Enzyme design. Sequence first.
Site: not given
Lengths: 102, 121, 245
Positions: B59, B68
Amino acid sequence: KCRRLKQESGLGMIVIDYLQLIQEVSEISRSLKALARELEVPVIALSQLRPMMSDIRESGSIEQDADIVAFLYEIIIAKQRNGPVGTVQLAFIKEYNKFVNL
Amino acid sequence: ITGIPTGFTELDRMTSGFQRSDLIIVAARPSVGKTAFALNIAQNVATKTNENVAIFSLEMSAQQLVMRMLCAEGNINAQNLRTGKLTPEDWGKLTMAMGSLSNAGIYIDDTPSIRVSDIRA
Amino acid sequence: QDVQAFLKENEEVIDQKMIEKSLNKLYEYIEQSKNCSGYHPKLVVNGRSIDIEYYECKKQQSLMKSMYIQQDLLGATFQQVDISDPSRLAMFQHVTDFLKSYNETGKGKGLYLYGKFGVGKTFMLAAIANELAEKEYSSMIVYVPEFVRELKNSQTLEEKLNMVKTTPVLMLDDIGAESWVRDEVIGTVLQHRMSQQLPTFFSSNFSPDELKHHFTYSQEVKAARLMERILYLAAPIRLDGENRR
């Protein structure tokens, strides 16, 4: 309508609409790469893929044939070669069709 | 504990591995935070629990995966840390969030829809 | 200099880090024209970020405004009003004692003007309109029935719920007049500033035991999310004195 309009009227900014139709795709991405030494003056474009970085790396070639790579879901421009890494917080008017300085 | 851990307390519960001979699978739905969860089965097993891990992310790229978990064990994901600089209470929340992001198994693979080939070797 | 003013204005709401985050805003604020040759820039705290909203342009009127009422009968003040009874024996005690404790962000508790007509709900806020007037702050006299008739029915929309919330002194008139649908106008105003804090202002005809026969039913435990923000910003007060109609 680009090189004859270059030495006729003006041309300092080429302005286009979106990508994934104007006729796979990893082909023509480089077509706008060989001009940057030929007409000499900044080129602009529009495309289609959240707000990541290697998504338009899937919808053509883009991240290697078009330097600055901006995104939409705050423009998360997490990879660029004209300015440093940033993100341009932009709001909208919602009727008067205007973009605003936050 | 036998054993190689999982990261979470209530996920190292019924497993204790997560061992060197089994394929492990965990997945979510459209907008539930999927790799947002995968980070933390690897974050520990990189920064703290010292083992080298190569995130061959199908991804996400490698110029996007950084945040993140600059946001995870750091709490700087609202400032917002999608852009810019820092405060007299945030100037160094990253001295050990991007100060704790290479002292770890972090050598990300970024490329899209790759076959099994350019992974194993 | 503008940043200093805004900082202390909303100190109770703003945090040191908020200042550095909204640095660009506060710096752009002071750098631009503070005056005007039709609006002026003022700082407002919106969540965790500080924004810059424009308010429309001795000194007693220009630094005073009103939302959805006429400025004919608002020529009111403190001190000089012929005081009647326990109707005004303790009314000009908490609007003059605190002309320097409307603290910017340092809890400067408010008032709630209820009771009966022609005496007190809106003229005790017209009193501040010409009293808190010389020092240079705005003080907008918002009226309720006149708001939610263009906001019960639907030009732009999500615009005037923020320069109603980015200036130091305010004055609201008639709470409970005319779950529910009176949602994104007045209901939110009460929840916000437990993490920001200034001097709060509301007023009506109905006391804290009467504000709630009109804000409309739900049949529930889904309406008292804004009413423990009056019981901790004043006292159960009304006004029964003299007719001025």
